[PDB]
Amino acid sequence: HVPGGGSVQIVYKPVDLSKVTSKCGSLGNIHHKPGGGQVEVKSEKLDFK
Amino acid sequence: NKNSSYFVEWIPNNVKTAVCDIPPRGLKMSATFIGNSTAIQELFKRISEQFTAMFRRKAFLHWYTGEGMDEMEFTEAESNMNDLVSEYQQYQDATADEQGEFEEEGEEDEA
């Protein structure tokens, strides 16, 4: 007989962050909205016709 | 007369007086001030820049939409806000002096 055991394997496994996916509201934007209307439309020059 | 730079030029005689017989307890005379100025455009700019800082990135919005708002409701309130702060700047540096009028252009030929 040959004594000294057979063989036994270690428990060890590789690791990864799985390309995981979540929500982001901030990622959906790069630009701001244009301004409101700064201009008068009511004014009249009061000509006596 | 002292503040001609801070009264609007197309509004003559800007002040509404009132002169009550009865001053507050303890004061021999007093007065309540009330002013409507283009200067308040700095409250509305401050609100709306601080609003955009939460809003454009959608900070704390789930607390409002979770009650039942939508982004549209924010959009209607922002559309009013951008109009109201513009309605200030529309009257800032507006004058009593008259603006001209124009014709149309767009025509040319060989000679």
CA gap A2, B12 in Å, rounded? 116
Is the Cβ of A37 closer than 8 Å to some Cβ of chain B? Answer: yes
Instruction: List the determination method.
Output: cryo-EM
Among B19, B75, B83, residue whose Cα is nearest residue B52: B75
- Resolution given for this structure, in angstroms: 4.1
CATH code assigned to B40-94:
1.10.287.600
SS (H, E, C) chain B: CCCHHHCCCCCCCCCCCCCCCCCCCCCCCCCCCCCCCHHHHHHHHHHHHHHHHHHCCCCCCHHHHCCCCCHHHHHHHHHHHHHHHHHHHHHCCCCCCCCCCCCCCCCCCCC
Q: Do A29 and B57 touch (CB under 8 A)?
A: yes
A10: Cα separation from own chain's centroid: 40
Tell me, what amino acid is at A13? K
CA gap B31, B18 in Å, rounded? 9
Give chain B positions within 8 Å (CB) of A27: none
DSSP A1-49: ---S-------------TT-----SGGG---PPPP------S-------
Pair of tokens at residue B44: 């509305």
CA gap B59, B51 in Å, rounded? 10
CA gap B93, B9 in Å, rounded? 9
